[PDB]
Amino acid sequence: GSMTKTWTLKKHFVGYPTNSDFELKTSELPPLKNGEVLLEALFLTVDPYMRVAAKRLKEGDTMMGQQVAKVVESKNVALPKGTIVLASPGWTTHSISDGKDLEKLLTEWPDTIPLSLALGTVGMPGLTAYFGLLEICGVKGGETVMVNAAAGAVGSVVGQIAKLKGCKVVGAVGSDEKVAYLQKLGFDVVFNYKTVESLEETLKKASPDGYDCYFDNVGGEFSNTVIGQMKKFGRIAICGAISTYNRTGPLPPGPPPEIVIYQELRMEAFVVYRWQGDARQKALKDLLKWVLEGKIQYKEYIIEGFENMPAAFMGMLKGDNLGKTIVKA
Amino acid sequence: SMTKTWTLKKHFVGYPTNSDFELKTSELPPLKEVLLEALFLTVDPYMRVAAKRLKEGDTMMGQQVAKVVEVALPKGTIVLASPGWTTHSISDGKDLEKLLTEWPDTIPLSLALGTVGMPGLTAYFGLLEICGVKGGETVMVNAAAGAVGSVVGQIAKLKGCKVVGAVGSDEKVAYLQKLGFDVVFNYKTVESLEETLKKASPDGYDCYFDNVGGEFSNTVIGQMKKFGRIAICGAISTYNRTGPLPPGPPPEIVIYQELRMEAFVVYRWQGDARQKALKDLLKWVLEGKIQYKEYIIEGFENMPAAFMGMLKGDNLGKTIVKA
Amino acid sequence: SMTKTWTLKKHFVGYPTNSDFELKTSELPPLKNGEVLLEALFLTVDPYMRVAAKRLKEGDTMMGQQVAKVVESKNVALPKGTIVLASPGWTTHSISDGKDLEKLLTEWPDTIPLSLALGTVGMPGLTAYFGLLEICGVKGGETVMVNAAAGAVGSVVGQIAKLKGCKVVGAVGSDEKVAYLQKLGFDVVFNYKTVESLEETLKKASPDGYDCYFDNVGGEFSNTVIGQMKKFGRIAICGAISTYNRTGPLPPGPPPEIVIYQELRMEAFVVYRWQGDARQKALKDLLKWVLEGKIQYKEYIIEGFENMPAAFMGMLKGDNLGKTIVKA
Amino acid sequence: SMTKTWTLKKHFVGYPTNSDFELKTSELPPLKNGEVLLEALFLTVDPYMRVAAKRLKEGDTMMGQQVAKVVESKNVALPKGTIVLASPGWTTHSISDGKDLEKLLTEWPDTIPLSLALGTVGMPGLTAYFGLLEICGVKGGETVMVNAAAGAVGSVVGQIAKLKGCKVVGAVGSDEKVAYLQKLGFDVVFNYKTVESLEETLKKASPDGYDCYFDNVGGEFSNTVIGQMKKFGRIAICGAISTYNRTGPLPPGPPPEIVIYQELRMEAFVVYRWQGDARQKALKDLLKWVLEGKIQYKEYIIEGFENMPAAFMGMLKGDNLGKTIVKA
């Protein structure tokens, strides 16, 4: 009898998640039918969107999420035993799939690149950075780009794509270790927004003439400050607003419209899965090539043990992670 | 010659009041240049924001249609000029823009300050380039009985769009229903703005021409369709606002709907684009496609009252002061 | 007999403007038995009118008190020539059956303006008297913070505080008002509009903190004062004029952690709570203190009933030094 | 001897999470003469720890009180077996010289849990007692609004109000808490998280308004209650838990025009203001009311010192019905 472990939402989140909001459960998977495969999670991801999306779950439901898995049992010759796939059964160690909701990893994947990169730099967060910067911000080279949560999965890729396109990049991060990381990736200016005396003065010193593009992952009052330093016709890619995801009171004041209008800002939000097919596969091939060419470096914040997946999720929300947060099954 | 000028005596706290202004009389020097007599002056919301950058004693800023009274600018010529809130001014001849060569005698000269002027250009580029309507969309427009808003709704209608308009009085509702706006409501008297917008367009809104901002816009944003476009033209609900700025739109909604929100300034468009827009606006006015209405206040001495009344919704159409 | 009346043409949005008011003329009917005909001598304008006007319907007469003279009388208790306080609103003439009228103190001298019955020896003075002596409960030797301190209420609060043995810190909005309160003997006076830091000015004024806070202003000003209240300090919430003309949400409240740790008492009051013997005794004390020079008065007189809206609006904007009064 | 201690690993942002705390083991120092070794039997978690943690340095022990027993004694006043209240923080074992310890009431009976010395017959119960009987000044027949009414303080407030002859309206965060307080005899109880309109619900609960408001919550909730206070209504500002875990800006303050029109008295207090005979008398009254059944006790017991952070976070989020207690 094939068994699985599953993390469920015991209680809807109030502020930051805590341990008591999750419940680990064990169950037996049904026998494998023809055309189906048994998938064993190798790496699971935790992601900020899970904090926003959990409100649509019912208590008792499995937490949503993607994973890299390997076929351990196969009644499907297209997915033979040993095949590596991306699947989204949620926070579970094993699952059954008929193949229609799976994705194989890029065919040209070298043995030197961790499979877990398919959940990060050469995965959904890397595609978020890719399309957000190149199509929503529309950088053509030479722009000054501000990016926050810059040492995270999305932000670290944003800055490095911007650098290879010829941009100046200013990155905000929450720890001194993250400062060193991004200065090693080539960021032009990197500062710890939690320890600077004034965010406003720090951003002005980093780019006294303002910012052409703002890849916004944080929202809130941080973004109000950046908006006051956007150049005329500046573009904001509204990627996320993680300062608001765990919020317990009211949203903060909005960006002051008189500045937005006088600077004629263009602020567009996007979802990474707007792009599919040709587009998404081509972007993944670019990200992989750039990793193999050394133009995109990566770091992973790997937490060992499926039983520590809630801890990985809460740690990521608190800024513990340098790079993509991953859970090794 | 003599002149009268309105100056900022005290910086505005909330809405202006009469004591924040001061009328001063002075003696213009003899020409040694042209002398211009104000015929029609305009008051506009931007003056509330721009006055914060003035010093107490400076003349209020503003545009006017004036006539020469004393060779390329002979006596009797009509010109747009922006010497501020004043009845008479001296010009070197370079800061003046002449009305369209084909300005017919069938439309008031004051339209050069409204529908065939800066407000009409704001509605034109805001709707056609920023929102980018092509026909068939559902457009939400607030301050819809004002100078910009009423032109936005009429352009949207001649492009084949459904137009939902919000105004602050029942008289403005009646006027816009005669103009043919698909749905018009008084936002000050509806039981629930959210309910009214849902009934006006159960499908949602493709475009939002935003003149108001604030909490009104947070509600509209909750009913934008996916990939909806918001033209951030103004935020009049914040210009005179005491206290802290209102919350912004919920980011979860902006992101899930993948909204594009772009602000603009009418004077971005210069040269050929500006002139083509003015000639489209004038053609639509002569064809009847854009009806015009002006809120004319008689007397230069009532200019502060016209400005304050406009900020508070007294005006139906472009607020104009006849000197 | 004709009368002029100021009516509310449009409800206020932000500060009142001229267009919100409309002057109307009418003819009053003949007197019935028991009634009198009053001619306004002095009318008052007060901050409360900005708050209470929201209760009016457009067309209604603006509310307000006045010192009036009986010019025709079918009321034996109110013969021709009698001076009274009446509240018919902003009107030059009115008819009264007598029951809503108040005679001035029988001991009222001819050496002081009649208009003090609308100020220091009237409703504002009573507001200062009971707000300071009963709500704050000053007992002698305390440090008192009072804002709008050059106004009808504030200037009396500080002077009563002085003659009780208190130190008085006063906040005002102009240097002219600073000079006036320095003449009245305020220990510390400052212009809250020009100081670099309100917090630092209040710390320097009283390093020890404040025992009592007579609050006329509210808003952020009061949040700063509350951060410097001593333990068990008392706040008399008299007004909140910084909010009366507001167009958006109120500013944040006082930080509750400070209110609780300092165990503050914050009590609001309305002057008309006190009646009968208590009210009469207060009026006799105020009059006595004025005749003895212990309470000096200053009036901001505006001539002409036609300028009453302008007097109301100037007062709201802080142009008045002392009680604002309109001479009919 | 060894001890386990919970320390603040990281300052809280919003509500705490588990990784903000860190459990450390250490060897206690030897017992000097006059000292005792205390073993925790029951520890409390309280809302004030969220506010007070802001002033700790990372690495510091979390503050808090406990019921402890003397397990080793060099102090003849505190022999082995003695039960004491002590405040060494979140720790299983501690040393004391006896000066900071409080013995239980001489008349404490064996029929009630010792953990009531941390709740109803302890600091939360004294808070309710003095806040209602001295700050609100309940005299019988008033209508009292109390929020967090199913918590340690609030549940005692409502039951004292009932035995003093008052009508009690309580607000709580769950249907189970509504049902429990209805069982105790609260006149009206509602779930503030699920009602369509807080304003409408409060008006239905007491159409004539409220004489007294025991305020544990503050924020927007209190602004709504203040709009329904009767004239001369009294507010006991006990806490403001809606602000303790906030991240953005404080909410608007109460509308001063309503505060002034209704002439409200709003006084904050700290339970430790009352000492000596007054405190001992209140404790004896609370114990008598428990033994008589007029104050039914209810504890939300969490087993295991290792679960103390989760008990604290659960209490802050409304998990607790009654006083939150950790059984060592």
Ligand SMILES: NC(=O)c1ccc[n+]([C@@H]2O[C@H](COP(=O)([O-])OP(=O)(O)OC[C@H]3O[C@@H](n4cnc5c(N)ncnc54)[C@H](OP(=O)(O)O)[C@@H]3O)[C@@H](O)[C@H]2O)c1
């Ligand atoms: N629209 C889309 O399709 C899409 C897809 C994926 C992700 N996203 C968004 O992209 C952003 C990053 O996602 P990710 O997967 O790359 O996560 P990540 O950056 O790897 O982890 C989240 C990071 O956010 C920072 N953070 C947390 N709370 C913060 C606060 N209050 N203020 C400022 N920074 C805070 C922390 O870094 P510091 O130490 O720098 O604070 C933390 O490490 C999120 O907003 C997410 O929702 C959007």
Ligand SMILES: NC(=O)c1ccc[n+]([C@@H]2O[C@H](COP(=O)([O-])OP(=O)(O)OC[C@H]3O[C@@H](n4cnc5c(N)ncnc54)[C@H](OP(=O)(O)O)[C@@H]3O)[C@@H](O)[C@H]2O)c1
């Ligand atoms: N970006 C640009 O280039 C540009 C250029 C010109 C103007 N603008 C903007 O366009 C807008 C309209 O300008 P306009 O010249 O046509 O003025 P208008 O609409 O003719 O007059 C302003 C109108 O705004 C409304 N209003 C005032 N306060 C309001 C509030 N708190 N909430 C909602 N509506 C309120 C009133 O109408 P109701 O009775 O409907 O309230 C009033 O009649 C303003 O925001 C202005 O700044 C932008």
Ligand SMILES: NC(=O)c1ccc[n+]([C@@H]2O[C@H](COP(=O)([O-])OP(=O)(O)OC[C@H]3O[C@@H](n4cnc5c(N)ncnc54)[C@H](OP(=O)(O)O)[C@@H]3O)[C@@H](O)[C@H]2O)c1
């Ligand atoms: N509770 C009662 O029974 C009662 C009775 C009467 C009056 N009151 C209150 O007492 C206060 C004083 O009334 P009053 O008759 O003596 O009027 P006043 O002080 O003679 O005139 C009002 C004054 O308030 C000041 N002010 C206006 N806006 C302000 C702002 N935003 N911030 C700070 N100060 C501001 C101005 O002086 P600066 O130049 O100093 O700004 C102005 O001179 C008012 O709040 C009124 O409602 C209460």
Ligand SMILES: NC(=O)c1ccc[n+]([C@@H]2O[C@H](COP(=O)([O-])OP(=O)(O)OC[C@H]3O[C@@H](n4cnc5c(N)ncnc54)[C@H](OP(=O)(O)O)[C@@H]3O)[C@@H](O)[C@H]2O)c1
């Ligand atoms: N001044 C003093 O000397 C003193 C002494 C002790 C305590 N206090 C205060 O008294 C209050 C109660 O303390 P306690 O020990 O009895 O705690 P408690 O009520 O046992 O627990 C706190 C309760 O507050 C409620 N709550 C939490 N967040 C809330 C919010 N945002 N809005 C409304 N209710 C919320 C929750 O119950 P629901 O299910 O009702 O949400 C929770 O169960 C606190 O404010 C505390 O600071 C003051």
Ligand SMILES: [Cl-]
């Ligand atoms: Cl710029």
Ligand SMILES: [Cl-]
């Ligand atoms: Cl008792």
Ligand SMILES: [Cl-]
């Ligand atoms: Cl927990």
